[PDB]
């Protein structure tokens, strides 16, 4: 029935993919088809580059989809139309299996008294929008993404796997428009909710990584940089030439050293034109980070112009323009004076909190605590006998 097709597929396949065919037939004989899902996924990681995933999956999906979970059918589906070049081709499977799952949820569910099937529709609507972005029909994709987003809020128990697909489709959308800030926040949700049983290879970590990082440097309100050190995706990728400088540029940015920053950017202008055309934004970005960092750890909440003039290594004239941007963006908030030559802030924006910041926070409460105690001892002694 299905035996001939698998036999044609195995002959086309390499000798290293040969035992995986053998296992499909072995498991089929036993009549456990869950064991069959496990094997199938393995095959599709190492054979998405051969065109053989586009015929293998159909045979299994269109018999079992009820003897195997909804996650299994979609798992296969994602890998198959992953590298596919014709989007007209791609659209037709997504629609055929959407209609199938709808029908499934009326019949199986009454009889077993178990098993949902309406979860599977949700994940297909992500992949239709993903397919629309790839045609360069960006706008259209966004109308289904709003519709799915509403459907999601109806649910009070939303899965990881499903919203991981959804945050993803959204993150691709913004960076095609080259919105750096919009991308970075939405990607932080994707990375954090990222599943343990991935659809992400080591090469795909690099490509994602790069998009995370570029946005970080070229932002204008992104001064959370420690969540690329709290995700393996960019954290342990740093040993590649490309990701050596790319990581360094973040460290330079963080610590406010102008010597290191100058050395680094010279190379990255000529080589990369996205760093080149945005080099002005990037340059003023380092300088704004100096302002907020330097006032936080000090227990005063104002700085002179003269302090800043030395700090950013620029004129007293520059100070006016950069400190002004800081109020606009909302990095800082406060009053600016040129007559008394001060900027006295009333707010610092929240950041991700590294080890030195916590030490200074500690030494502040040791000062505080000691005062309450002294103010207290004097008042316990005075009027000791009268409290009635």
């Amino acid at each position: 029935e299905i035996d001939t097709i698998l036999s044609t597929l195995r002959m086309e396949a390499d000798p290293s993919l040969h035992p995986l065919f053998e296992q499909f037939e072995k498991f089929y004989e036993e009549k456990l088809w869950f064991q069959l899902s496990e094997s199938l996924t393995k095959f599709f990681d190492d054979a998405k580059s051969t065109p053989l995933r586009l015929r293998l999956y159909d045979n299994f999906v269109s018999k079992f989809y009820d003897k195997i979970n909804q996650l299994s059918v979609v798992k296969y589906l994602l890998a198959s139309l992953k590298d596919s070049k014709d989007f007209d081709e791609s659209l037709k499977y997504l629609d055929d299996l959407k209609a199938q799952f709808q029908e499934l949820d009326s019949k199986k569910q009454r009889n077993n008294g178990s098993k949902d099937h309406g979860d599977g529709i949700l994940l297909i609507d992500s992949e239709i929008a993903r397919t629309y972005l790839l045609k360069n029909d960006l706008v259209k994709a966004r109308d289904l993404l709003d519709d799915l987003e509403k459907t999601l809020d109806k649910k009070d128990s939303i899965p990881l796997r499903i919203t991981n697909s959804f945050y993803s489709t959204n993150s691709q959308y913004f960076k095609f428009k080259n919105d750096f800030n919009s991308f970075y926040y939405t990607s932080l949700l994707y990375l954090s909710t990222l599943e343990p049983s991935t659809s992400i290879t080591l090469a795909e970590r690099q490509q994602l990584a790069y998009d995370l990082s570029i946005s970080a440097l070229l932002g204008d309100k992104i001064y959370n940089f420690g969540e690329l050190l709290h995700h393996p995706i960019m954290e342990t990728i740093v040993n590649d030439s490309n990701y050596d400088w790319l990581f360094q540029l973040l460290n330079a940015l963080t610590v406010g050293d102008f010597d290191k920053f100058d050395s680094l950017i010279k190379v990255q202008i000529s080589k990369i034109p996205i760093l080149a055309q945005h080099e002005s934004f990037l340059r003023q970005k380092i300088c704004l980070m100096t302002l907020i960092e330097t006032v936080f750890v000090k227990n005063i909440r104002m700085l002179s112009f003269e302090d800043i003039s030395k700090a950013t290594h620029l004129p007293k004239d520059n100070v006016e323009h950069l400190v002004m941007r800081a109020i606009s963006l909302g990095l800082l908030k406060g009053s600016i004076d040129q007559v008394n030559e001060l900027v006295t802030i009333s707010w610092v924006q929240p950041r991700i909190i590294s080890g030195d910041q916590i030490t200074k926070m500690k030494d502040r409460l040791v000062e505080w605590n000691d005062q309450v105690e002294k103010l207290g001892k004097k008042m316990e002694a005075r009027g000791q006998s009268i409290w009635v």
Partner: protein, 203 residues
């Protein structure tokens, strides 16, 4: 009201809860007052467990609201908070981590019913912990408040110490609140502070 429950000391995530009693209780008490419906469950305390996270999924099924966890401290080793209120919610969690199940503290207030007030005052024959009546009560109170401020602040010192020395995970909500604390700290020699001094002469 009590329900039947059983607990194991070998693994602590092994327990019995009786559902059948729950069904009978609801039927009986509806007639007593049409103002009793399921709103969650108390946990007798004195502490919050992580095992109360699992028990919560039972009560989440029984009633369509997020169910209140009510800690009733009956061992009273905390000078405040005899009642703590907690509603389990799901939120995505700092330091690159997953959607985790957590219990978020809310106000745990007492305001009392009319009905309740009448028995409460009657039984009372003490001059109360705090009432804030005469000047005598509030002079006591001022000094009590100061000891109060210090006690909360102390636990915070030891939290920051332990992040950088004893590797408890960095939760940016607690660090962020301290930022906000420091930005509402009056600074001497500003016009706000100077005004306080003048007003003291006038009062």
């Amino acid at each position: 009201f009590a329900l039947p429950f059983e607990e194991d000391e070998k693994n602590s995530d092994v327990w019995f809860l009786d559902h059948n009693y729950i069904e009978n209780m609801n039927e009986m008490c509806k007639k007593i007052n049409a103002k009793e419906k399921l709103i969650g469950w108390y946990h007798s305390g004195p502490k919050l467990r992580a095992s109360d996270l699992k028990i919560n999924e039972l009560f989440k099924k029984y009633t369509q609201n997020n169910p209140l966890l009510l800690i009733v401290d009956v061992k009273q080793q905390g000078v405040g908070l005899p009642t703590d209120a907690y509603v389990a919610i799901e939120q995505v969690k700092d330091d690159g981590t997953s959607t985790e199940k957590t219990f978020l503290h809310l106000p745990c207030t007492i305001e009392a019913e009319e009905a309740e007030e009448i028995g409460v005052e009657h039984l009372l024959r003490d001059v109360r912990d705090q009432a804030a009546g005469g000047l005598s009560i509030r002079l006591t109170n001022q000094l009590k408040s100061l000891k109060g401020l210090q006690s909360k602040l102390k636990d915070v010192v030891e939290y920051l110490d332990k992040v950088i020395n004893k590797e408890l995970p960095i939760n940016h909500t607690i660090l962020g609140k301290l930022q906000d604390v420091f930005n509402l700290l009056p600074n001497l020699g500003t016009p706000d502070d100077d005004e306080i001094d003048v007003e003291n002469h006038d009062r």
